[PDB]
Design a binder for this molecule. Sequence first.
Ligand SMILES: *[C@@H]1O[C@H](CO)[C@@H](O[C@@H]2O[C@H](CO)[C@@H](O)[C@H](O)[C@H]2NC(C)=O)[C@H](O)[C@H]1NC(C)=O
Length: 361
Amino acid sequence: YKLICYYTSWSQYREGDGSCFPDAIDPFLCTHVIYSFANISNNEIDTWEWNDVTLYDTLNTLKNRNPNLKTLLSVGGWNYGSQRFSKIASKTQSRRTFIKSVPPFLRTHGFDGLDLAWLWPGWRDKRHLTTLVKEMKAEFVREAQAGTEQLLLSAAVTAGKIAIDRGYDIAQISRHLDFISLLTYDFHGAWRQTVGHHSPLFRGNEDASSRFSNADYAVSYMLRLGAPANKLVMGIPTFGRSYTLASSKTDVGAPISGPGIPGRFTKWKGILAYYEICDFLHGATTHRFRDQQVPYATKGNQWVAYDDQESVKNKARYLKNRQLAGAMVWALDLDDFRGTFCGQNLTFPLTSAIKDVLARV
Ligand SMILES: *[C@@H]1O[C@H](CO)[C@@H](O[C@@H]2O[C@H](CO)[C@@H](O)[C@H](O)[C@H]2NC(C)=O)[C@H](O)[C@H]1NC(C)=O
């Protein structure tokens, strides 16, 4: 099994226990840790926050404890516009400078591969990733003739029908990537005004349109597109999405006035870290959609759509049955990495649950 576990750079600024450095990360836990994004400046990869060079050394030493543990840097992200990305891989001047620019960098810092997080390319881009990604690997195969372990190249891909079709030539980009992470917690989110679960496993026999919106379809689709089994990694949320209810209506179908308040540690509108959610559950009403096989919680005006131990194992089982390459956990820093908020003295409750399913077979 492969268990790619992202780590986000900025989680360091969370106050108190919220704060998480390459420190709290178990070296034996996942197989691949990906430092969440980098930046680009003067068409040459570059760091993002100020002390990255150090965090790049905190994280990469975990490998001294687990010689098999592989690390990766991701380029792109939410806070990195498509425009800047789309402007780099169409002007072959800018594309080839950026390429040549990263093997050295990744080497210098001990990263074993690069992970492209071009957050959703447009229909005018499908042609451009294709060759950006393509020859990135021509470079990587070339650098490897220097007598060293070939750098790895992977991509984070959206999981929405429309989103995939629009800007991804999966069939061809699958034969140059080492693995693909399916953002399979990409289905409901923020707000055309109904309460919904962002990462459903199955359909929910209840509504018809938006079958497209679930992990099973996303997965069958990708395989049908031509993406090999042994190269698909199914994304699993370690966080939840919050919603301020607009009405005493709580069952799914209920109105939404807005985004959910922040957690005291996470401080984002509409997002909650699993550890924050564990405290939220105290005094709550827990629910679970039987077919999508995922839970949600409500307290006061707040409505939370999230994943707990079993919902995540269930996914883990699904992943194993179709014979995928492995699982992906969005943010190690959104799990209970301190393992002090969620009752059981277990640390990284969620990411372990997956591991367990992926391990006892
Ligand atoms: C990412 O790299 C860019 C490269 O210029 C850094 O620069 C800013 O972005 C605009 C767009 O070109 C520039 O015109 C401004 O001069 C810059 N603004 C700032 C805040 O200095 C950018 O800072 C890098 N990103 C991070 C956060 O690491």
